Amino acid sequence: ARIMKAIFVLNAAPKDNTWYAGGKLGWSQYHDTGFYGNGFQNNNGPTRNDQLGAGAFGGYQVNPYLGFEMGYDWLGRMAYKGSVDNGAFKAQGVQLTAKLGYPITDDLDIYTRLGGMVWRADSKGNYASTGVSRSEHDTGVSPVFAGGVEWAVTRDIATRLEYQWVNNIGDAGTVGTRPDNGMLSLGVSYRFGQEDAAPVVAPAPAPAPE
Numbered sequence: 078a079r080i081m082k083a084i085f086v087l088n089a090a091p092k093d094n095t096w097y098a099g100g101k102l103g104w105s106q107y108h109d110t111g112f113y114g115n116g117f118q119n120n121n122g123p124t125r126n127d128q129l130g131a132g133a134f135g136g137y138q139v140n141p142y143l144g145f146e147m148g149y150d151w152l153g154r155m156a157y158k159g160s161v162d163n164g165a166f167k168a169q170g171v172q173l174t175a176k177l178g179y180p181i182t183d184d185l186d187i188y189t190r191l192g193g194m195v196w197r198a199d200s201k202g203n204y205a206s207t208g209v210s211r212s213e214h215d216t217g218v219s220p221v222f223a224g225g226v227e228w229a230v231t232r233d234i235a236t237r238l239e240y241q242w243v244n245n246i247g248d249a250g251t252v253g254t255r256p257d258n259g260m261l262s263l264g265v266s267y268r269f270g271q272e273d274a275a276p277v278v279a280p281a282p283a284p285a286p287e
Contacts, residue, residue: 093139094138094139095138095144095269096268097135097136097137097266098134098136098266099267100131100132100133101132101237102131102264103130103239104130104260105153106153106256124256127223128153128155130150131151131279132148132150132172132262133148134146134147134148135201136188143175144177145174145175145176146172146174146175146176147171147172147173147272148170148174148190149172150169150172150196150261161203166199166202168195168197168219169196170194171194172192172195172221174191174192174193175192175194176190184229185228185229187224188225189243189247192221195218196217196218197216198211198213198215198216199200200214201214220254222270223240223258224240224241224243225240226238226243232270233267237263237265238262238263239259239263240261241257241258241259241261252270
């Protein structure tokens with residue numbers, strides 16, 4: 078083991094300003110605990126449990142302490158089949174949380190995000206319902222914190238797995254989570270890489286005649 082390590086960095090410059098973005102898929106909501114005293118439990122019993130939620134995550138560190146993590150709540154309901162639909166207003170979930178983690182060598186790293194999610198409801202349009210539907214215009218907001226690990230495979234394409242619970246526990250004085258604390262899911266991300274480019278035909282010979 079004999080390598081120069083003074084001020085000649087080749088892997089990364091002397092700056093802790095990195096940026097990585099990706100997306101995870103899994104379950105956002107689900108009923109498991111709690112019950113009801115109503116005779117009508119299961120009104121319908123289909124044969125397709127199509128429940129998949131998409132989520133875009135983005136992290137960026139500004140100082141050698143922690144980095145900001147922005148999430149995006151997308152997809153979650155199964156319904157896309159009709160002659161004519163409505164598209165007046167578009168809905169999209171936006172999450173704001175702080176992510177803190179660290180690598181193990183140079184490919185395996187662990188991180189945890191603590192914050193909240195803020196999404197909007199779909200405005201009223203040409204919809205058709207006779208029981209369950211959203212006829213209100215409120216803003217969805219709820220605090221949450223998840224934790225998982227990440228693995229780097231490609232030069233600009235890594236994969237990460239997020240969970241609701243963490244193997245260890247850092248610092249915490251109080252926890253207020255009725256529905257849940259975190260969410261388990263699988264996703265893939267990539268580092269912020271961009272090489273320079275300048276019109277310079279050095280190798281490629283252009284001048285044919287002169």
